[PDB]
């Protein structure tokens, strides 16, 4: 089952910018059919900071219909971009190659002005 392989492992997913999400799932102690999402994200998007090193991710996954929401704070040992991104979406296992379709928000500052920027990432499974 493609949903069960997802839960059993540490799968990698590459988006249209060449960035890579690696997900690991741990059962929630209180929420049925729900998993704590851990793993890491490597940003390879041209024109951005915090590229080429793993950032931890966190969030939650609903196994009933394979919906996920996860976040990265852009702070690690290598680089700090003083921002955070949240992705929310769903997995589609219906094709020969699995895809994760997401919308994201990036919160950040430009000078003293805060902003939240929107976008979309489509991740294709690495197999």
């Amino acid at each position: 089952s493609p949903d069960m392989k997802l839960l059993a492992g540490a799968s990698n997913w590459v988006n249209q910018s060449g960035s890579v999400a690696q997900f690991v799932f741990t059962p929630s102690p209180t929420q049925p059919q729900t998993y704590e999402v851990s793993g890491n994200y490597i940003n390879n998007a041209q024109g951005t900071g915090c590229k080429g090193t793993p950032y931890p991710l966190s969030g939650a996954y609903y196994s009933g219909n394979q919906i996920i929401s996860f976040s990265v704070v852009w702070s690690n040992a290598s680089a700090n971009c003083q921002s955070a991104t949240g992705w929310t979406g769903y997995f589609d296992f219906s094709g020969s190659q699995a895809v994760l379709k997401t919308d994201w928000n990036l919160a950040f500052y430009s000078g003293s002005t805060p902003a939240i920027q929107q976008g979309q990432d489509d991740f294709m499974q690495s197999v």
């Binding site: 900071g49 702070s75 290598s78 680089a79 971009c81 990036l106 950040f108 500052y109 430009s110």
Partner: peptide, 10 residues
């Protein structure tokens, strides 16, 4: 770490 103003701008 190296510090950037944001993810978008150095």
């Amino acid at each position: 770490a190296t510090v950037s103003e944001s993810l978008l701008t150095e």
